[PDB]
Amino acid sequence: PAVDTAEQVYISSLALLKMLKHGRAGVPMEVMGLMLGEFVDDYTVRVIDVFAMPQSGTGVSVEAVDPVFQAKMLDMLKQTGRPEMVVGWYHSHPGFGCWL
């Protein structure tokens, strides 16, 4: 199988506002956070909420995803009414454009 070019990632206004806020707070350094949403179907993934990962010396890496922090945040957000799963991650790229 394969994915199509028509795949649309839906970013809610709250998610974009939170991501921009975290990015503008992070500068000059790079911050990161986990995206909460749903893979509703194959031709689109929807993100509804996003939460910030506390800054770490590792930077933006696998080790920056604090396991205990992520588990606690997911557990506490599930009680509130957001039982979403982690659809991905975001990280700010100060100065240089959006690439990997």
């Binding site: 000059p28 350094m29 506390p54 800054q55 770490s56 010396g57 590792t58 930077g59």
Partner: protein
């Protein structure tokens, strides 16, 4: 006699909670202290607790906070390892002499 049970239980509980919370805070600080430690000098110290740091990259930045060290144990001219990008002081550095100076002896 009530002070035995009540106070000993409460104080040991606070001791343990504060102890593992201190270990968590210290671990967070240690992991956050990214080792590169761009070497810089404190050109002056001024009250708001704030420092003006000239990095080894020949540029001076003002620091809204001192960082992870104590402002009292600092003065103009000391060598401090600031962050690469945040430029915040992470630890003080012992007096470092250039190789030419050591060869001068």
């Amino acid at each position: 006699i009530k002070i035995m049970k009540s106070e000993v239980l409460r104080v040991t509980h606070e001791l343990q909670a504060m102890k593992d919370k201190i270990k968590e805070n210290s671990e967070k600080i240690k992991v956050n202290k990214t080792l590169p430690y761009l070497v810089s000098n404190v050109i002056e110290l001024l009250d708001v607790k704030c420092a003006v740091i000239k990095t080894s990259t020949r540029q001076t930045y003002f620091l809204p906070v001192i960082g992870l060290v104590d402002a009292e144990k600092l003065k103009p001219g000391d060598l401090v390892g600031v962050n690469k990008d945040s430029y915040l002081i992470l630890e003080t550095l012992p007096t470092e002499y250039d190789s030419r100076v050591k060869a001068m002896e």
